[PDB]
């Protein structure tokens, strides 16, 4: 058998049997990423301290002015 299970009309020979099974497409798949691409594009060490400290300087001035208005 095995030439009556995989017919492929013609083929003249036991080789050239159909042989259609699963696999990667011709040319493989896309290059798959595996590294750790963690983007560190956030606020830096400064700009975070200077945003906080700018607030505990202007916002505290505003607390002061609000205390003046309340008084």
């Amino acid at each position: 058998t095995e030439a009556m299970i995989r017919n492929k009309p013609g083929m003249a020979s036991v080789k050239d049997m159909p042989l259609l099974q699963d696999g990667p497409p011709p040319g493989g798949f896309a290059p798959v990423r595996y590294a750790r691409r963690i983007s560190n594009t956030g606020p830096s060490a400064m700009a975070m301290f200077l945003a906080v400290s700018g607030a505990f300087a202007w916002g505290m001035y505003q607390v002061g002015q609000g205390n003046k208005i309340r008084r």
Partner: protein
Amino acid sequence: THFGGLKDEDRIFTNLYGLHDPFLKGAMKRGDWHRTKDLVLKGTDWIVNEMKKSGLRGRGGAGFPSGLKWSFMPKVSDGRPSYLVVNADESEPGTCKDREIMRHDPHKLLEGCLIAGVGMRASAAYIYIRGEYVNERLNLEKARREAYAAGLLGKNACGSGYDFEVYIHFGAGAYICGEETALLESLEGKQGKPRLKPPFPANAGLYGCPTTVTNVETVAVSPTILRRGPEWFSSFGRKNNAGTKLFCISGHVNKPCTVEEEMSIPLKELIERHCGGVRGGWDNLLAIIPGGSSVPLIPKNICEDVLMDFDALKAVQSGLGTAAVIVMDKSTDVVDAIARLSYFYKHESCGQCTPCREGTGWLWMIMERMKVGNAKLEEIDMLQEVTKQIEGHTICALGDAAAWPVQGLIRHFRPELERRIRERAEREL
């Protein structure tokens, strides 16, 4: 030397074509039963010795050296009456050389029964006529009744002191029953199924009694071998192979005929001289099955200079069986012819052993596919391997006789098989 030329005074089987009377008053004129009393009186050892010296080989497919075969029979009789079964039955495809001895000079066959019987210490001869040879065994029973009435056979061998009687058995249409170890059984009354060789017929054959199975042509040339010269007989053919085989040019020759002619004859010479010629000239030849049907093909490129003797045809990757040369010309479908041969071996295979019983139906199926082209280019190597699985393993040589036609067809005409397969492939799609 250069063989082939056999003069009409050297042909052993005179009245082959039945032109003259076959029976007595017509056989004594041809030298039959001439002085067999002296021969029987010359003894058994002298007969065996002259048969061995004459180098007579088996006229049947086996090709065994006769005489040496007759020396296998026991000398001192231990109560088992040594028999002598004559293998009249042929049934080989192509072979009619037996059919021209059973009729048309059967008295040579009866005198050979007697001379081989005294030769191998026998006590009775069972001429196993092929079943279909009804007219032939009727002629032979007529000649047997004659040789009984003429005191030749029975209770005194031609007036001598030898008690020897010839009984005529006849099978019924079975090529397998013709085999040496199956003749004994098909004559013992059982089915025509061969027995294994470890008990040899010379040791325990017919009825368990010793016996030797001889083709009619070997037993029938025995008389004239002894009455003429064993040196004269061995003066024909090549060194080892010697004698005058009775050929049967079977098919696709413009004048098919069975004609006795010296062995070691060039196959081309035989064809061109006696049977006329390959239909449409020698250049029209396609293949030739030189022996019976139990022998591979000859593809016409090694058939020009091949000699019809056992040794050369064996050296050409073939065999000289009953020398029933089957000729096939460029007009035949050689694969269909070998497919019908394999069908024959499927039909006439007593089925006793598995390698032949099954693999021969298998060979027939694969051949009836490849003759259309329904196979695959690698099956031609399965077919070779299937045949080599059948060949050495079967009980008798019928396994051989069924693997050899297909093996020869492959070995020689593999281009034609592959061409049919590729043409089937291109016919699809």
